[PDB]
Design a binder for this molecule. Structure first.
Ligand SMILES: [Mg+2]
Ligand SMILES: [Mg+2]
Ligand SMILES: [Mg+2]
Ligand SMILES: [Mg+2]
Ligand SMILES: [Mg+2]
Ligand SMILES: [Mg+2]
Ligand SMILES: [Mg+2]
Ligand SMILES: [Mg+2]
Ligand SMILES: [Mg+2]
Ligand SMILES: [Mg+2]
Ligand SMILES: [Mg+2]
Ligand SMILES: [Mg+2]
Ligand SMILES: [Mg+2]
Ligand SMILES: [Mg+2]
Ligand SMILES: [Mg+2]
Ligand SMILES: [Mg+2]
Ligand SMILES: [Mg+2]
Ligand SMILES: [Mg+2]
Ligand SMILES: [Mg+2]
Ligand SMILES: [Mg+2]
Ligand SMILES: [Mg+2]
Ligand SMILES: [Mg+2]
Ligand SMILES: [Mg+2]
Ligand SMILES: [Mg+2]
Ligand SMILES: [Mg+2]
Ligand SMILES: [Mg+2]
Ligand SMILES: [Mg+2]
Ligand SMILES: [Mg+2]
Ligand SMILES: [Mg+2]
Ligand SMILES: [Mg+2]
Ligand SMILES: [Mg+2]
Ligand SMILES: [Mg+2]
Ligand SMILES: [Mg+2]
Ligand SMILES: [Mg+2]
Ligand SMILES: [Mg+2]
Ligand SMILES: [Mg+2]
Ligand SMILES: [Mg+2]
Ligand SMILES: [Mg+2]
Ligand SMILES: [Mg+2]
Ligand SMILES: [Mg+2]
Ligand SMILES: [Mg+2]
Ligand SMILES: [Mg+2]
Ligand SMILES: [Mg+2]
Ligand SMILES: [Mg+2]
Ligand SMILES: [Mg+2]
Ligand SMILES: [Mg+2]
Ligand SMILES: [Mg+2]
Ligand SMILES: [Mg+2]
Ligand SMILES: [Mg+2]
Ligand SMILES: [Mg+2]
Ligand SMILES: [Mg+2]
Ligand SMILES: [Mg+2]
Ligand SMILES: [Mg+2]
Ligand SMILES: [Mg+2]
Ligand SMILES: [Mg+2]
Ligand SMILES: [Mg+2]
Ligand SMILES: [Mg+2]
Ligand SMILES: [Mg+2]
Ligand SMILES: [Mg+2]
Ligand SMILES: [Mg+2]
Ligand SMILES: [Mg+2]
Ligand SMILES: [Mg+2]
Ligand SMILES: [Mg+2]
Ligand SMILES: [Mg+2]
Ligand SMILES: [Mg+2]
Ligand SMILES: [Mg+2]
Ligand SMILES: [Mg+2]
Ligand SMILES: [Mg+2]
Ligand SMILES: [Mg+2]
Ligand SMILES: [Mg+2]
Ligand SMILES: [Mg+2]
Ligand SMILES: [Mg+2]
Ligand SMILES: [Mg+2]
Ligand SMILES: [Mg+2]
Ligand SMILES: [Mg+2]
Ligand SMILES: [Mg+2]
Ligand SMILES: [Mg+2]
Ligand SMILES: [Mg+2]
Ligand SMILES: [Mg+2]
Ligand SMILES: [Mg+2]
Ligand SMILES: [Mg+2]
Ligand SMILES: [Mg+2]
Ligand SMILES: [Mg+2]
Ligand SMILES: [Mg+2]
Ligand SMILES: [Mg+2]
Ligand SMILES: [Mg+2]
Ligand SMILES: [Mg+2]
Ligand SMILES: [Mg+2]
Ligand SMILES: [Mg+2]
Ligand SMILES: [Mg+2]
Ligand SMILES: [Mg+2]
Ligand SMILES: [Mg+2]
Ligand SMILES: [Mg+2]
Ligand SMILES: [Mg+2]
Ligand SMILES: [Mg+2]
Ligand SMILES: [Mg+2]
Ligand SMILES: [Mg+2]
Ligand SMILES: [Mg+2]
Ligand SMILES: [Mg+2]
Ligand SMILES: [Mg+2]
Ligand SMILES: [Mg+2]
Ligand SMILES: [Mg+2]
Ligand SMILES: [Mg+2]
Ligand SMILES: [Mg+2]
Ligand SMILES: [Mg+2]
Ligand SMILES: [Mg+2]
Ligand SMILES: [Mg+2]
Ligand SMILES: [Mg+2]
Ligand SMILES: [Mg+2]
Ligand SMILES: [Mg+2]
Ligand SMILES: [Mg+2]
Ligand SMILES: [Mg+2]
Ligand SMILES: [Mg+2]
Ligand SMILES: [Mg+2]
Ligand SMILES: [Mg+2]
Ligand SMILES: [Mg+2]
Ligand SMILES: [Mg+2]
Ligand SMILES: [Mg+2]
Ligand SMILES: [Mg+2]
Ligand SMILES: [Mg+2]
Ligand SMILES: [Mg+2]
Ligand SMILES: [Mg+2]
Ligand SMILES: [Mg+2]
Ligand SMILES: [Mg+2]
Ligand SMILES: [Mg+2]
Ligand SMILES: [Mg+2]
Ligand SMILES: [Mg+2]
Ligand SMILES: [Mg+2]
Ligand SMILES: [Mg+2]
Ligand SMILES: [Mg+2]
Ligand SMILES: [Mg+2]
Ligand SMILES: [Mg+2]
Ligand SMILES: [Mg+2]
Ligand SMILES: [Mg+2]
Ligand SMILES: [Mg+2]
Ligand SMILES: [Mg+2]
Ligand SMILES: [Mg+2]
Ligand SMILES: [Mg+2]
Ligand SMILES: [Mg+2]
Ligand SMILES: [Mg+2]
Ligand SMILES: [Mg+2]
Ligand SMILES: [Mg+2]
Ligand SMILES: [Mg+2]
Ligand SMILES: [Mg+2]
Ligand SMILES: [Mg+2]
Ligand SMILES: [Mg+2]
Ligand SMILES: [Mg+2]
Ligand SMILES: [Mg+2]
Ligand SMILES: [Mg+2]
Ligand SMILES: [Mg+2]
Ligand SMILES: [Mg+2]
Ligand SMILES: [Mg+2]
Ligand SMILES: [Mg+2]
Ligand SMILES: [Mg+2]
Ligand SMILES: [Mg+2]
Ligand SMILES: [Mg+2]
Ligand SMILES: [Mg+2]
Ligand SMILES: [Mg+2]
Ligand SMILES: [Mg+2]
Ligand SMILES: [Mg+2]
Ligand SMILES: [Mg+2]
Ligand SMILES: [Mg+2]
Ligand SMILES: [Mg+2]
Ligand SMILES: [Mg+2]
Ligand SMILES: [Mg+2]
Ligand SMILES: [Mg+2]
Ligand SMILES: [Mg+2]
Ligand SMILES: [Mg+2]
Ligand SMILES: [Mg+2]
Ligand SMILES: [Mg+2]
Ligand SMILES: [Mg+2]
Ligand SMILES: [Mg+2]
Ligand SMILES: [Mg+2]
Ligand SMILES: [Mg+2]
Ligand SMILES: [Mg+2]
Ligand SMILES: [Mg+2]
Ligand SMILES: [Mg+2]
Ligand SMILES: [Mg+2]
Ligand SMILES: [Mg+2]
Ligand SMILES: [Mg+2]
Ligand SMILES: [Mg+2]
Ligand SMILES: [Mg+2]
Ligand SMILES: [Mg+2]
Ligand SMILES: [Mg+2]
Ligand SMILES: [Mg+2]
Ligand SMILES: [Mg+2]
Ligand SMILES: [Mg+2]
Ligand SMILES: [Mg+2]
Ligand SMILES: [Mg+2]
Ligand SMILES: [Mg+2]
Ligand SMILES: [Mg+2]
Ligand SMILES: [Mg+2]
Ligand SMILES: [Mg+2]
Ligand SMILES: [Mg+2]
Ligand SMILES: [Mg+2]
Ligand SMILES: [Mg+2]
Ligand SMILES: [Mg+2]
Ligand SMILES: [Mg+2]
Ligand SMILES: [Mg+2]
Ligand SMILES: [Mg+2]
Ligand SMILES: [Mg+2]
Ligand SMILES: [Mg+2]
Ligand SMILES: [Mg+2]
Ligand SMILES: [Zn+2]
Lengths: 204, 118, 131, 122, 10, 59
RNA sequence: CGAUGUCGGCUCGUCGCAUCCUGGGGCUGAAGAAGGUCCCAAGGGUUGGGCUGUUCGCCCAUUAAAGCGGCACGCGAGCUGGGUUCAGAACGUCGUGAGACAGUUCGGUCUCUAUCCGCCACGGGCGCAGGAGGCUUGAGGGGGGCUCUUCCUAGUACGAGAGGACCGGAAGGGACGCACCUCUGGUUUCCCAGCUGUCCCUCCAGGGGCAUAAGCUGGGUAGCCAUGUGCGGAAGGGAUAACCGCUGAAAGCAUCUAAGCGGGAAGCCCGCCCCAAGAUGAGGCCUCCCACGGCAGCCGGUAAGGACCCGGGAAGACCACCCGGUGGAUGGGCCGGGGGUGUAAGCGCCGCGAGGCGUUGAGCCGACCGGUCCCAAUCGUCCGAGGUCU
RNA sequence: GAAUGCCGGCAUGAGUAACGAUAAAGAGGGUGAGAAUCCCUCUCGCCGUAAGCCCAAGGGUUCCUACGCAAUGGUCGUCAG
RNA sequence: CGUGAGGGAAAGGUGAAAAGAACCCCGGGAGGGGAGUGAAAUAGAGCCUGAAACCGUGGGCUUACAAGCAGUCACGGCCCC
């Protein structure tokens, strides 16, 4: 159940057997394991990974202790991968070979307060024929006296994006260990520069 | 959304905003220091910096470009002969913006001074 | 890190430098590997290039030709391995980067708007004088 | 991107000149036909005494389109019109020549008879 | 089912 | 629309509960290191005209 | 009846199951394929069009299918206003008439501001017996749940023939969903060019305003995007429905059942994805501070830490979140690259001239990828444990 | 204690909608207890078969100057019908 | 208010006496704080009395796992006499 932290760098395509392959490039290596969570100690199993080096000037004292106890130089992000336990004290892109399928988790781009047409692909209202100031409105939200209320979960306008999203079963197109690059075919949540997690896929 | 868009709108349509900057340039290049609202000051920096840099180039081309925004032939001449020279060896950052402590009475707008640098 | 540099890095393995420079307006023949049955062959597509979108490794260019009465436009990645070669067959002088306006012009009218780019022709012949 | 109401030129000699799509035969509820797809169509304009006549409801395979088709090799091709060749229930042209180029896509979709009769395949 | 307005328009 | 309108007068308890967030926060002020007069941080001092160690403006 | 707005449509759903399809099954006057009929099944799905105000219905073209009902004949403080109920007008018809009709016809005022509950989002407060910075478990909840075609098996089983399988295995689609922006394709209010009229600068040349809240036109980076790209529905495990059994009495036979055991659905539980400890039942782990002064309490100064303030941000209505604050690349400038435009001005040459050619892929040049302390994030302030009892 | 009573006062909605044409503003100087809002200058924009000028109705001192800013001005006011 | 005929309000009270607050202080002023007057100044002219709704400051008790025609009965806690 291997996994790794990384940053989305950007997309392009490569050519592979006279085929254009759209890819997102992820900087993944190298992630120092900084804690192991164990069934005896913690009740479950996983690896806290760290990623990108941090200026010690900016690391407070409780954090420093945590890093110290690992003999690990301070790092900007800590995140766990569950049910993964690497033999090394460091995880790098090498844990993936081209051909493998992965799941990538990102924080999606933020749309802010979104209307119903962008959030939920509502149809909105006519643009003419008499529609009166309701071209992007949701329409009805209910019945009448029965039930006299609006369902929990009713799709409505509101904040949208900047959310955890995990896209699944992406092909690993290539891995360039010398530069800590993982090339995954397709699209990955969030902006370039955003933090992502690459896991072995759960599909078969 | 506004994702990675550069530029204030300052509640002006296109042609008014442009005039706002030019008139502010003429004023700043004229007096060396002016006061405005903080955000107007923050946009003036770049607008004027480019005109000063162009003045540092000195060519005829540069003058004719500067004259699109600034229009006053004497003013440009001051820019070219008096202003640009003091920045021959300065690399950008010919303007500075410092925030004033007192808000404006009639509308509470925060003020800042914008000035050409030494 | 430098994200731009890393993309350029991923891309460097696929970049080409063996292809001639050309501009919108030039007439060009692209010999393109093409798959059919059971073989692959080279098909030539020859026409005016009406667009070149630039984006480094991802720049693409569009070639327009008339084929048995019907206009056809083809869009090619400039760095595509499927391009065998490109031959410059004529240099045209455009005044515009994008030449969509010729989609509505007659063959006479096109020829009048895209006269031979006598400068870049001369320039072409002056190379092609080798050692 | 052919859809019901779309007029297509007919690129054969069935005598039909113009057909208007009335359905895309690609599943239960397809929004668009592209190259290699079969539509059902009305004949809106034909020449006198052909195989087909104005009013006929016929099938046709779309053979070139004004919306560009993209290809796995990263390229795309685009034609100046939307054209279809009229076929019978076994995908064979009801006509005997096909005019103008056609999209190679037809071949992988088993329109060999049409692909071969075509002056050009792009 | 068409049935008649029981109220007039406002 | 059909002109909505409050169905009951708001009780004093309710009105005042709504204002539970209405308190002003006092201006954040720091001493001016040249003249010791209180002022907003990041502003040229209006008392003495100093900022960043130097005399910025006539006061 | 001191008003419970009334048909149809749109929008948005949600439920029932007497199921239209898809899954499971018994019987068949079930050879096969296809059907009929009943049973189980509500997870998902259930198309586009012509007519008509229509609901309905008929019709065209498709489909796995084109289900039927409830929700104030769901939904007018959500839209419409074609239909019916006002005043005008006309036809038919009735009435001497004024006028009339569970007839027809053309026309005809649909109300910016949401208090409470409810719903979508976001915070502020307090709590979670020391105070803090991280990382987490998942009670519980939500999301999802569709399906077709072709090929192989095999032209095999079956069948006189036409036709044509079970099981198992491949490939390719439609619609839907989430994400994305490399490509394709949009936009890109000033990023570039061209162009007209007019006024102006400065006469020429070169420019500026205005013609829209871009004057017009040709283009167009980032961004945000779909028409573009990737991926999803599963697999799998468990328990079941109808239905099929094994073993088996009562009842020497028989019996799926009374004891016991098995098989068995798109359905159910788990599995996937997302929320989630206000889960007051307030969880856990790692790290940091410490037992300070005066009188489970008050007042004061601190600790770890936090906030304030500032520069900002693919975060954002405010708030929040995230990054940075000279021990600095946070924005602005400047430089380099990209990218757009498409060869500036000036000068020289040719031409009577409009123009042309060269200098020149020039000049200009948003946002992208970077560098660089030139400009600004100066200087600081205020909060903040001393840990209740068996 | 009620008559959608009468008269008056004061609440609620609420620091909410709004502040009356999307022709448009910016800076420097002056004045003053106080200035986005008054004066002056420069720059910018709008009208120009008018949004300029002259008559008649109607209005009735609103004209000019000095001194004022409680109220009137949808904000401010040192300004003003 | 209405073209007009015509309609048609609200609005009383310092104190015995103005003795109606000189002068100083803050403030542009308004306003207040002292001083002074008066038997009395929360009789200070926005003046006798000065109710109630309504707005506030300060104190006691109470309240952030709770379900409400708001009370009532009971017990307990805290605060006061
Ligand atoms: Mg993340
Ligand atoms: Mg956003
Ligand atoms: Mg909407
Ligand atoms: Mg959406
Ligand atoms: Mg959409
Ligand atoms: Mg729609
Ligand atoms: Mg629409
Ligand atoms: Mg419509
Ligand atoms: Mg209307
Ligand atoms: Mg509208
Ligand atoms: Mg209703
Ligand atoms: Mg109810
Ligand atoms: Mg958010
Ligand atoms: Mg490879
Ligand atoms: Mg991005
Ligand atoms: Mg917008
Ligand atoms: Mg940016
Ligand atoms: Mg902006
Ligand atoms: Mg701008
Ligand atoms: Mg403005
Ligand atoms: Mg505004
Ligand atoms: Mg604008
Ligand atoms: Mg303008
Ligand atoms: Mg304009
Ligand atoms: Mg710049
Ligand atoms: Mg400052
Ligand atoms: Mg401030
Ligand atoms: Mg003021
Ligand atoms: Mg890039
Ligand atoms: Mg060929
Ligand atoms: Mg006919
Ligand atoms: Mg309404
Ligand atoms: Mg409303
Ligand atoms: Mg309305
Ligand atoms: Mg509303
Ligand atoms: Mg209202
Ligand atoms: Mg009400
Ligand atoms: Mg009240
Ligand atoms: Mg109160
Ligand atoms: Mg309230
Ligand atoms: Mg009634
Ligand atoms: Mg009532
Ligand atoms: Mg009513
Ligand atoms: Mg009602
Ligand atoms: Mg009605
Ligand atoms: Mg329904
Ligand atoms: Mg049933
Ligand atoms: Mg079935
Ligand atoms: Mg059968
Ligand atoms: Mg049979
Ligand atoms: Mg059956
Ligand atoms: Mg169902
Ligand atoms: Mg359901
Ligand atoms: Mg249903
Ligand atoms: Mg029609
Ligand atoms: Mg219809
Ligand atoms: Mg109908
Ligand atoms: Mg009917
Ligand atoms: Mg079927
Ligand atoms: Mg239908
Ligand atoms: Mg009914
Ligand atoms: Mg109804
Ligand atoms: Mg209904
Ligand atoms: Mg209704
Ligand atoms: Mg309505
Ligand atoms: Mg209705
Ligand atoms: Mg309603
Ligand atoms: Mg209503
Ligand atoms: Mg209602
Ligand atoms: Mg609506
Ligand atoms: Mg009608
Ligand atoms: Mg009718
Ligand atoms: Mg009528
Ligand atoms: Mg009528
Ligand atoms: Mg009539
Ligand atoms: Mg008659
Ligand atoms: Mg009758
Ligand atoms: Mg009669
Ligand atoms: Mg009669
Ligand atoms: Mg009409
Ligand atoms: Mg009518
Ligand atoms: Mg009507
Ligand atoms: Mg309306
Ligand atoms: Mg409310
Ligand atoms: Mg309620
Ligand atoms: Mg909270
Ligand atoms: Mg909070
Ligand atoms: Mg645990
Ligand atoms: Mg759970
Ligand atoms: Mg709960
Ligand atoms: Mg076979
Ligand atoms: Mg046989
Ligand atoms: Mg599939
Ligand atoms: Mg791009
Ligand atoms: Mg694009
Ligand atoms: Mg592209
Ligand atoms: Mg494009
Ligand atoms: Mg420009
Ligand atoms: Mg312009
Ligand atoms: Mg001009
Ligand atoms: Mg000229
Ligand atoms: Mg002008
Ligand atoms: Mg004008
Ligand atoms: Mg204008
Ligand atoms: Mg126009
Ligand atoms: Mg034009
Ligand atoms: Mg375009
Ligand atoms: Mg444009
Ligand atoms: Mg773009
Ligand atoms: Mg799409
Ligand atoms: Mg299963
Ligand atoms: Mg048996
Ligand atoms: Mg037995
Ligand atoms: Mg027996
Ligand atoms: Mg049993
Ligand atoms: Mg069983
Ligand atoms: Mg069995
Ligand atoms: Mg089982
Ligand atoms: Mg399934
Ligand atoms: Mg979580
Ligand atoms: Mg907790
Ligand atoms: Mg948690
Ligand atoms: Mg509970
Ligand atoms: Mg906890
Ligand atoms: Mg901030
Ligand atoms: Mg911000
Ligand atoms: Mg910080
Ligand atoms: Mg600091
Ligand atoms: Mg920086
Ligand atoms: Mg920089
Ligand atoms: Mg470049
Ligand atoms: Mg370039
Ligand atoms: Mg040239
Ligand atoms: Mg030149
Ligand atoms: Mg000459
Ligand atoms: Mg550049
Ligand atoms: Mg450095
Ligand atoms: Mg300080
Ligand atoms: Mg009574
Ligand atoms: Mg009332
Ligand atoms: Mg009332
Ligand atoms: Mg009353
Ligand atoms: Mg009363
Ligand atoms: Mg009354
Ligand atoms: Mg009253
Ligand atoms: Mg009030
Ligand atoms: Mg507010
Ligand atoms: Mg409100
Ligand atoms: Mg509001
Ligand atoms: Mg409001
Ligand atoms: Mg109003
Ligand atoms: Mg407002
Ligand atoms: Mg106004
Ligand atoms: Mg206004
Ligand atoms: Mg307008
Ligand atoms: Mg001044
Ligand atoms: Mg003022
Ligand atoms: Mg003032
Ligand atoms: Mg001023
Ligand atoms: Mg103004
Ligand atoms: Mg003035
Ligand atoms: Mg005009
Ligand atoms: Mg004129
Ligand atoms: Mg008068
Ligand atoms: Mg007077
Ligand atoms: Mg006079
Ligand atoms: Mg006067
Ligand atoms: Mg006057
Ligand atoms: Mg005066
Ligand atoms: Mg006044
Ligand atoms: Mg005043
Ligand atoms: Mg005043
Ligand atoms: Mg007075
Ligand atoms: Mg007033
Ligand atoms: Mg006022
Ligand atoms: Mg007013
Ligand atoms: Mg004065
Ligand atoms: Mg006045
Ligand atoms: Mg009257
Ligand atoms: Mg009168
Ligand atoms: Mg009267
Ligand atoms: Mg009275
Ligand atoms: Mg008296
Ligand atoms: Mg008296
Ligand atoms: Mg005095
Ligand atoms: Mg004074
Ligand atoms: Mg006084
Ligand atoms: Mg006082
Ligand atoms: Mg006094
Ligand atoms: Mg006395
Ligand atoms: Mg006495
Ligand atoms: Mg008293
Ligand atoms: Mg008294
Ligand atoms: Mg009184
Ligand atoms: Mg008395
Ligand atoms: Mg009294
Ligand atoms: Mg009183
Ligand atoms: Mg009282
Ligand atoms: Mg109190
Ligand atoms: Mg509880
Ligand atoms: Mg409690
Ligand atoms: Mg009780
Ligand atoms: Mg008791
Ligand atoms: Zn100071």
């Amino acid at each position: 159940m291997k996994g790794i932290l990384g940053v989305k760098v950007g997309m392009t395509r490569i050519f592979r057997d006279d085929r254009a392959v759209p890819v997102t490039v992820i900087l993944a290596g190298p992630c120092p394991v900084v804690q192991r969570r164990t069934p005896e100690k913690d009740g479950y199993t996983a690896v806290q990974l760290g990623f990108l080096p941090q200026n010690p000037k900016r690391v407070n004292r409780p954090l420093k202790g945590h890093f110290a106890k690992a003999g690990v130089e301070p790092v900007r992000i800590l995140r766990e991968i569950r049910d993964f336990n690497p033999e090394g004290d460091t995880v790098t892109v090498e844990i993936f070979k081209p051909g493998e399928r992965v799941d990538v988790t990102g924080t999606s781009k933020g749309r802010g307060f979104a209307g119903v047409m962008k959030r939920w692909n509502f149809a909105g209202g006519p643009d003419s024929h008499g529609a009166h100031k309701i071209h992007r409105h949701p329409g009805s939200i209910g019945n009448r006296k029965t039930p006299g209320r609006v369902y929990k979960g009713k799709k409505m306008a509101g904040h949208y994006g900047a959310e955890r999203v995990t896209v699944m079963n992406l092909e690993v197109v290539d891995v360039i260990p010398e530069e800590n690059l993982l090339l995954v075919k397709g699209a990955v949540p969030g902006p370039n520069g955003g933090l992502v997690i690459v896991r072995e896929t759960k599909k078969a | 959304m506004r994702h990675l868009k550069s530029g204030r709108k300052l509640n002006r349509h296109s042609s008014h905003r442009l005039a706002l900057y030019r008139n502010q340039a003429k004023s700043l290049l004229t007096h060396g220091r002016i006061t405005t609202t903080v955000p107007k000051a923050k946009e003036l920096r770049g607008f004027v910096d480019h005109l000063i840099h162009l003045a540092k180039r000195g060519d005829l081309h540069a003058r004719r470009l500067v004259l699109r925004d600034l229009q006053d032939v004497k003013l440009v001449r001051k820019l070219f002969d008096e202003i640009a020279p003091r920045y021959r060896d300065r690399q950008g950052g010919y303007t500075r913006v410092l925030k004033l402590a007192e808000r404006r009475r009639g509308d509470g707008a925060p003020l800042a001074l914008v000035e050409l640098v030494e | 890190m430098n994200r731009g540099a890393l993309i350029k890095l991923v891309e460097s393995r696929y970049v080409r430098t063996d292809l001639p420079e050309f501009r919108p307006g030039d007439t060009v023949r692209v010999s393109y590997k093409v798959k059919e049955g059971n073989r692959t062959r080279i098909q030539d597509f020859e026409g005016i290039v009406i667009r070149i979108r630039r984006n480094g490794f991802n720049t693409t260019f569009t070639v327009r030709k008339v084929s048995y009465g019907v206009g056809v436009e083809r869009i090619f990645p400039l760095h595509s391995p499927l391009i065998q070669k490109i031959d410059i067959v004529q240099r045209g002088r455009a005044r515009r980067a994008k030449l969509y306006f010729i989609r509505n012009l007659s063959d006479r009218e096109i020829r009048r708007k895209l006269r031979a780019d006598r400068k870049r022709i001369d320039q072409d012949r002056a190379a092609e004088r080798a050692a | 991107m052919i859809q019901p109401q779309t007029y297509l030129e007919v690129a054969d000699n069935t005598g039909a000149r113009k057909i208007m799509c009335i359905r895309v035969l690609k599943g239960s509820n397809a929004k668009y036909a592209t190259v290699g797809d079969v539509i059902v169509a009305s004949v809106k304009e034909a020449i006198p005494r052909g195989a087909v006549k104005e009013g006929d409801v016929v099938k046709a395979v779309v053979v070139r389109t004004k919306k560009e088709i993209k290809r796995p090799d990263g390229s795309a091709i685009r034609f100046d019109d939307n054209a279809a060749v009229i076929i019978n229930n076994q995908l064979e042209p009801r006509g005997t020549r096909v005019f103008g180029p056609v999209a190679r896509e037809l071949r992988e979709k088993g329109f060999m008879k049409i692909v071969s009769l075509a002056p050009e395949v792009l | 089912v068409d049935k008649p307005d029981y109220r007039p328009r406002p | 629309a059909k002109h909505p309108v409050p169905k009951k007068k708001t009780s004093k308890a309710r009105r005042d509960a709504r204002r539970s967030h209405h308190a002003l926060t006092p201006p954040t002020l720091v001493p001016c290191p040249e003249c010791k007069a209180m002022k907003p941080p990041h502003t040229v001092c209006p008392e003495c005209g100093y900022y960043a160690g130097r005399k910025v403006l006539e006061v």
